[PDB]
Design a protein around this ligand. Structure first.
Ligand code: F3P
Ligand code: F3P
Ligand code: MN
Ligand code: MN
Ligand code: MN
Ligand code: MN
Ligand code: MN
Ligand code: MN
Lengths: 543, 543
């Protein structure tokens, strides 16, 4: 008379999330940490090999040390750019290095630099195709395959650079390889390019690969390790706070049709918000992703059509008086939601001088609504086309909701315009959103539909063009490619109104969705080995 | 060009407040405690002498164990009640004993046994006046003086008994040789009768008095002291919590002007809610008393007349949309105030299954508006007549807000109907409110109005009858006298719709009120020794 997608219970118990009594939770560490930051800062500014700095830049970044070295990352690339005239689209053709040019291409464009597609030009035969000689330089080769991910629609060279590269990386790995760890790094990124590969939940493996590295420096290896632990401690801190909240809602028992995953739900933010200083944003998001998970279960599992429409609309008119009029589980949910935006908007009014409640409120509302059109089809047995779906999709998934919540806390000051521009669900918001969706849709879907939910994109795909599932998979993979391109531009600006740290969260959501839904089982639903990176980046300390 | 209270900061430090944490939170602790109940109970129930059985319920109470010995106290008095026949309309001749009759009359009436006034008749003489021959029995005379506080206009005999024992008790005290330290127990209740002595912030002394008591029982003394500590700890826990809330409002820095006295604001609740199990009622109440303190400041000190007519109103219409147009300091106060009722209400909705938000809201609205009426008399010339003031005061002293807020936490179940009876503001609520007030006015007054405010009773009485200050202080003391009677009556009442505990806190706020405002200003600022009382029932352990 009610359904329930049978999600099992959170593999992490209270007493654990409460025990979690860290260790590098105290200063002496960071003083030490912050004391190497300096040696490394200048082993950095001391080096002269530009390609070396590039190499060390890329490394510091794959290990989450990126927070210290920020304006260094900038002085260095600023320079290389200029002292290599990377600006000009018109090429000089020093035949340049494939490896050094791709590496620098990559970090420059990432660090927002204008670096013409035509840079890789001097590596083409006169047939205009890529140079089949290059076929052997695979350090470089692997690295060009890695700069491609930084393109935009209308950048064939890049688009075919990725093609050539993959094929050779491919074979090289396919045969016994001209190494062993090469064989793996090639596959590691042939599984996910660094550009779509989210840092923080991954630093560890890179940390020890650098450890096993020769050239390798310790001031580094070790600075890398300490900081690593200095934040983990901290995550744990934000962790409890969010838990502490979860527990109070007692949805855990009072509204349990709902998957419980406060941890998974806080773990996303471990990637979505990489700049350590935005803690409250991560805490607040532990709870926001949570309220989402529950409101979505209410929509695609539990609640009925009457029940939903009613909920939907009271939300719409944020009618806390009629609070008691909807079923009982929709009261406690609704009030906990009104309690969350109100306590959250208090902290923003409190610490930034602004009444943000009309917005986080909207954020919720729209999210609610779109979850509604998804019931309706499904309940009303309407099955939509790929576009109808893809259109609700990028919002029902909650991307803007979480992403708009995040803006008020990563950015330090905004104007009403910056704000309204955002709430268009500014393009940025829609593209990182699409990725989380397309990736999420590509992960779930089978069960989304099976234990109830409207068809997903692969699904509407295969009905649409009437295709094989593979066909849909490929299609939807492509879609992701395409919006990443869309996103690349936007993030590297549009005279984007969005500040630094914010847009990066936007980009990082699309990134974390790709880890989270890379082998499957939701943002935790049934957790494959998403359970490893999790206990590894949240609980288990480093060597 | 905004007045200021001329206030000092919480004498207690956050890092202290935050730290303090005591060893007795360790279970085995109360276990010991709970092995002694079993035997002090044992000693109790096995007692034979009924006058020793009463002297024990009385200590078990004043010493704080009143909680684990409940269903015992009942049997021992239903037994003395019935046996000694106190439920009869007559019986005397000239034969009961003074100390036992008074002692047993006090406990039975306290416990709501009906024990007619005429009992003390048997100690009267020819003229229908207390036999002077009694001028001697002082353990007796003291016992009587003290049971005269359990009367009800009706009761002249008790009113005329209050006199007897007081005069000769003064004698006995002016004579340093009647004993010496009894001379101090005598004057102790001569200052505040047991009937109007909140227990909890008073146990310590009783404890060591019982301790030096010759006849004393050490397992009692033992159970006694261990409990004191096991509950002072739970206080501290609650303390931190309501603190933790305080720190968040950030009123300290943002709504400076109002006094910061949160441990005081909690200490209050150390008397109002004596049954240990109401832990939340006391946490929630730390936060409530705080908002009251503040909102009160906002009215009698910072806020302007337009700025208050405004606050007053929006809260009355209660809406966080036009929250946008109050002064920034009134957006923060109104929003956090809303958040609290919303939070508190989510708790009651969580646990008790009901939406109490439209009532706590209403508690807050009426409190506000009475703060307004006074604010208009201030700004708007008017010096009310001693009765118009008295009719607003008992409401403007927060009183009902405090209590109504409380009813919901201490009452497992209820009915719209008894809620409503409550919310018209039952007499039960009114009388205790009254005590808190008059005790306040009697105490506060001075800087209250000199440093700007409306005339408190002391003052309207003087103006009114053009009287010296004694008279008015006397009148008020006499008034406290009367509402207390009206209070005995309602607490033992007929069909009070309130439960033991609740009606309990109603008379207990009047008691706590007579403590804080007994040495002047109490609450927070002057609190003379009022600090050694807190420092002692919140931080400083026993033996
Ligand atoms: C509640 C959802 F939106 C999740 C669990 C993922 C997003 C929640 C985060 C980022 C904390 O996916 P789900 O598959 O349940 O959404 P769906 O109902 O659109 O399929
Ligand atoms: C702190 C206040 F707000 C009080 C103590 C009144 C009520 C607060 C309590 C009971 C802890 O003092 P105040 O003298 O200003 O009361 P009044 O302004 O209503 O006369
Ligand atoms: Mn779902
Ligand atoms: Mn859904
Ligand atoms: Mn899904
Ligand atoms: Mn005042
Ligand atoms: Mn006042
Ligand atoms: Mn006062």
């Amino acid at each position: 008379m009610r359904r329930s997608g049978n999600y099992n219970p959170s593999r992490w118990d209270v007493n654990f999330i409460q025990s979690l009594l860290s260790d590098y939770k105290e200063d002496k560490h960071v003083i030490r940490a912050s004391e190497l930051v300096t040696l490394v800062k200048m082993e950095l500014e001391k080096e002269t090999d530009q390609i070396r700095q590039l190499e060390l830049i890329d490394d510091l970044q794959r290990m989450g040390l990126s927070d210290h070295f920020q304006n260094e990352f900038k002085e260095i690339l600023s320079s290389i750019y200029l002292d290599h005239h990377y600006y000009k689209n018109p090429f000089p053709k020093e035949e340049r290095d494939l490896y050094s040019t791709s590496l620098a291409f990559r970090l420059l464009r990432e660090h927002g630099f204008q670096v013409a597609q035509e840079v890789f030009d001097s590596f083409k035969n006169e047939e205009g195709e890529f140079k089949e000689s290059l076929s052997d330089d695979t350090r470089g080769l692997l690295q060009l395959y890695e700069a491609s991910f930084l393109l935009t629609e209308g950048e064939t060279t890049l688009e075919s650079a990725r093609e050539f590269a993959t094929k050779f990386l491919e074979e090289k790995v396919n045969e016994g390889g001209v190494d062993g760890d090469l064989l793996t790094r090639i596959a590691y990124s042939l599984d996910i390019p660094l550009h779509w590969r989210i840092k923080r939940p991954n630093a560890p493996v890179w940390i020890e690969w650098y450890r096993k590295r020769p050239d390798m420096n310790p001031v580094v290896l070790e600075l890398a390790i300490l900081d690593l632990n200095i934040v983990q401690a901290q995550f744990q801190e934000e962790l409890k706070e969010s838990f502490r909240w979860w527990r109070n809602t007692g949805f855990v028992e009072k509204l349990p049709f709902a998957r419980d995953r406060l941890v998974e739900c806080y773990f996303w933010n471990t990637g979505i918000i990489e700049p350590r200083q935005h803690a409250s944003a991560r805490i607040m998001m532990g709870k926001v992703n949570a309220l989402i998970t529950v409101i979505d279960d209410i929509y695609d599992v539990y609640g009925t059509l009457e029940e939903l429409e009613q909920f939907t609309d009271l939300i719409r008119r944020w009618d806390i008086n009629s609070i008691d009029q909807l079923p009982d589980y929709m009261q406690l949910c609704f009030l906990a939601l009104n309690n969350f935006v109100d306590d959250t908007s208090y902290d923003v009014m409190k610490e930034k001088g602004v009444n943000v409640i009309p917005y986080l409120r909207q954020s919720w509302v729209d999210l609610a609504d779109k979850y509604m059109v998804e019931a309706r089809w499904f309940y009303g047995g309407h099955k939509p086309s790929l576009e109808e779906y893809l259109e609700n999709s990028w919002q029902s998934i909650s991307g803007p909701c979480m992403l708009t919540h995040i803006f008020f806390r990563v950015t330090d000051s905004f104007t009403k315009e910056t704000v309204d521009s955002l709430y268009k669900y500014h393009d940025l918001v829609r593209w990182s959103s699409f990725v989380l969706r397309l990736a999420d849709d590509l992960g779930t879907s089978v069960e989304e539909v099976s234990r109830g939910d409207v068809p997903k994109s692969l699904q509407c795909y295969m009905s649409d063009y009437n295709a094989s599932e593979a066909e849909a998979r490929k299609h939807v993979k492509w879609l992701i490619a395409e919006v990443w391109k869309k996103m690349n531009a936007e993030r590297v600006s549009k005279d984007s109104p969005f500040g630094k740290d914010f847009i990066g969260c936007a980009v990082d959501l699309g990134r974390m969705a790709q880890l989270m839904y890379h082998n499957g089982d939701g943002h935790g639903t049934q957790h494959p080995i998403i359970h490893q990176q999790m206990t590894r980046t949240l609980f288990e300390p480093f060597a």
